[PDB]
Amino acid sequence: SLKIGIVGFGNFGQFLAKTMIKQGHTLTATSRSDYSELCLQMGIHFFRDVSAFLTADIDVIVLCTSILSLSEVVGSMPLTSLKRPTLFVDVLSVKEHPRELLLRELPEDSDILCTHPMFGPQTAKNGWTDHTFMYDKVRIRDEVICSNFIQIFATEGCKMVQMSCEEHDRAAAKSQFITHTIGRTLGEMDIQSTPIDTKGFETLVKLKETMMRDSFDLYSGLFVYNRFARQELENLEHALHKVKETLMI
Amino acid sequence: QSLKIGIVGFGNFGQFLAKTMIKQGHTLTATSRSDYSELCLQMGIHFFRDVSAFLTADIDVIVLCTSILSLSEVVGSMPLTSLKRPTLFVDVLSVKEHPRELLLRELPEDSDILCTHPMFGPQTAKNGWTDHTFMYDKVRIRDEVICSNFIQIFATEGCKMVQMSCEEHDRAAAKSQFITHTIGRTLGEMDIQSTPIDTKGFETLVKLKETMMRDSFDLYSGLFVYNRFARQELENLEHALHKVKETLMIQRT
Ligand SMILES: NC(=O)c1ccc[n+]([C@@H]2O[C@H](COP(=O)([O-])OP(=O)(O)OC[C@H]3O[C@@H](n4cnc5c(N)ncnc54)[C@H](OP(=O)(O)O)[C@@H]3O)[C@@H](O)[C@H]2O)c1
Numbered sequence: 001s002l003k004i005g006i007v008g009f010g011n012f013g014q015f016l017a018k019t020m021i022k023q024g025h026t027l028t029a030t031s032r033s034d035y036s037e038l039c040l041q042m043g044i045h046f047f048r049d050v051s052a053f054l055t056a057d058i059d060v061i062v063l064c065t066s067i068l069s070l071s072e073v074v075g076s077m078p079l080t081s082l083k084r085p086t087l088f089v090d091v092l093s094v095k096e097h098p099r100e101l102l103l104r105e106l107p108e109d110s111d112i113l114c115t116h117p118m119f120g121p122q123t124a125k126n127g128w129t130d131h132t133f134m135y136d137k138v139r140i141r142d143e144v145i146c147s148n149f150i151q152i153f154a155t156e157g158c159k160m161v162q163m164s165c166e167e168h169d170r171a172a173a174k175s176q177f178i179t180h181t182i183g184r185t186l187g188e189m190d191i192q193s194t195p196i197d198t199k200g201f202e203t204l205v206k207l208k209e210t211m212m213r214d215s216f217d218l219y220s221g222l223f224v225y226n227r228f229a230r231q232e233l234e235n236l237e238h239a240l241h242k243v244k245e246t247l248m249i
Numbered sequence: 250q251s252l253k254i255g256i257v258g259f260g261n262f263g264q265f266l267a268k269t270m271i272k273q274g275h276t277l278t279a280t281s282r283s284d285y286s287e288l289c290l291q292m293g294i295h296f297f298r299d300v301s302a303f304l305t306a307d308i309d310v311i312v313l314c315t316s317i318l319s320l321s322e323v324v325g326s327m328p329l330t331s332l333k334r335p336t337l338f339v340d341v342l343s344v345k346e347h348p349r350e351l352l353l354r355e356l357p358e359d360s361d362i363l364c365t366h367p368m369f370g371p372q373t374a375k376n377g378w379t380d381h382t383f384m385y386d387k388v389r390i391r392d393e394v395i396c397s398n399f400i401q402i403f404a405t406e407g408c409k410m411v412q413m414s415c416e417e418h419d420r421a422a423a424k425s426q427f428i429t430h431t432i433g434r435t436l437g438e439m440d441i442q443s444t445p446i447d448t449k450g451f452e453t454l455v456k457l458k459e460t461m462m463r464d465s466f467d468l469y470s471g472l473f474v475y476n477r478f479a480r481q482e483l484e485n486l487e488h489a490l491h492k493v494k495e496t497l498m499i500q501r502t
Pocket residue numbers: 007008009010011012013031032033034064065066067069072073091092093094116117118119120121122214215217218
């Protein structure tokens with residue numbers, strides 16, 4: 001049982017909180033917007049003031065804010081007020097950025113665990129089993145607390161993948177970022193089902209619908225803060241152009 | 250007497266009203282600028298992200314719970330021709346001449362208008378609404394049954410029921426609640442602290458400060474910008490403080 005504080009209690013913060021509560025951990029939260037009533041509903045304590053959140057009795061701080069805002073959020077936190085050395089976990093969709101920034105900004109005696117649960121409310125509605133949880137033990141000295149946190153995902157059946165933040169971003173730029181870009185592009189075309197949909201087109205409509213559920217902040221953070229994304233955007237754009245020219249001749 | 254109620258603006262006060270409406274057995278729908286999907290799931294409310302879908306739902310009464318400052322933009326963005334049926338619009342803004350004038354100008358003629366201000370909220374009616382004041386003005390009512398069923402929501406909670414014009418409301422609110430918030434905001438800027446030797450009077454001021462600082466600055470701003478009688482009351486406050494101050498100087502001398 002862990003005392004887990006969520007920083008950024010939005011869509012994915014709430015998603016993680018439901019399962020950690022179910023396992024019996026003690027959850028608290030803080031966020032830019034006021035989630036007092038939703039935390040009341042869920043049965044957890046919300047701290048309108050980040051300073052009171054950080055002086056509380058807390059084993060793990062999970063950074064669930066948007067990629068775009070992480071630097072501002074960490075910058076606004078009075079981290080010297082931490083009672084104890086504390087494990088910091090990030091769940092951002094890109095990994096080199098939070099690794100670099102937490103190593104730079106956190107107090108040195110705070111541990112760092114960089115993760116990406118490769119799933120969320122769209123793909124893992126009825127549980128985490130067989131979805132991938134990527135993690136990088138960036139700066140761990142309390143292996144007990146870190147293992148307790150990682151076990152949250154192991155006991156839910158996740159496929160557990162240790163890899164560096166760099167290898168994550170290289171792979172994510174080719175897969176997740178391309179998938180979102182295609183979903184977003186179909187969203188601007190506003191593709192719609194017809195009476196003669198093929199199965200392939202049905203999957204694309206569904207892919208469009210699920211990708212459009214993520215914020216534009218999230219999508220844009222995949223591009224801005226993954227140094228490998230720009231070339232994958234080029235690869236996609238160049239390939240489409242080459243396909244077009246085989247048709248145009 | 251159980252209603253299909255849609256709430257526009259599911260923020261701090263919209264949620265406050267919904268809690269008691271759910272307790273009474275009403276069926277609630279909500280829409281808002283921000284996404285309250287999860288919280289509405291918890292409370293059993295049907296949440297529409299898009300106001301156009303909101304307006305085609307099965308709604309008896311639409312309750313406008315957006316900030317004073319945003320009412321004009323929110324109503325303006327509503328495709329009001331999407332309305333399935335003539336519908337009662339209720340306003341719960343803390344000032345009243347403004348929504349009354351705007352809804353009479355903007356709403357479809359066939360839609361009824363009840364202009365209200367519950368003189369209480371999360372800070373003062375935390376443990377129930379009993380013997381708090383609920384003000385209302387029947388601006389344009391033709392279906393008396395639905396209007397009466399809505400007003401019943403507050404009467405059954407033990408509210409003090411005050412029928413009064415929107416003008417008379419703003420006249421009284423400029424002299425009272427605006428002054429109260431101004432004093433609380435002034436004490437908040439002074440950041441007054443408790444002391445070894447607090448008197449009871451000072452204790453109530455500290456408490457008043459804390460309660461007044463819990464409302465949004467948008468709200469406090471709306472009390473002044475959209476009440477044509479607030480400006481004179483802010484002058485009367487400064488004028489009174491300076492009158493007291495000068496008598497101290499004369500007493501000093
Ligand atoms: N399935 C998923 O959605 C998923 C999966 C894996 C990882 N992630 C990652 O989890 C994190 C949150 O994802 P999300 O889906 O909830 O959507 P998101 O739009 O990326 O992030 C929303 C959260 O970021 C906060 N936020 C945004 N801008 C802020 C700013 N200037 N200042 C302070 N706080 C700000 C928001 O606070 P408020 O809510 O209080 O306004 C909210 O809590 C992201 O880093 C995402 O990359 C998401």
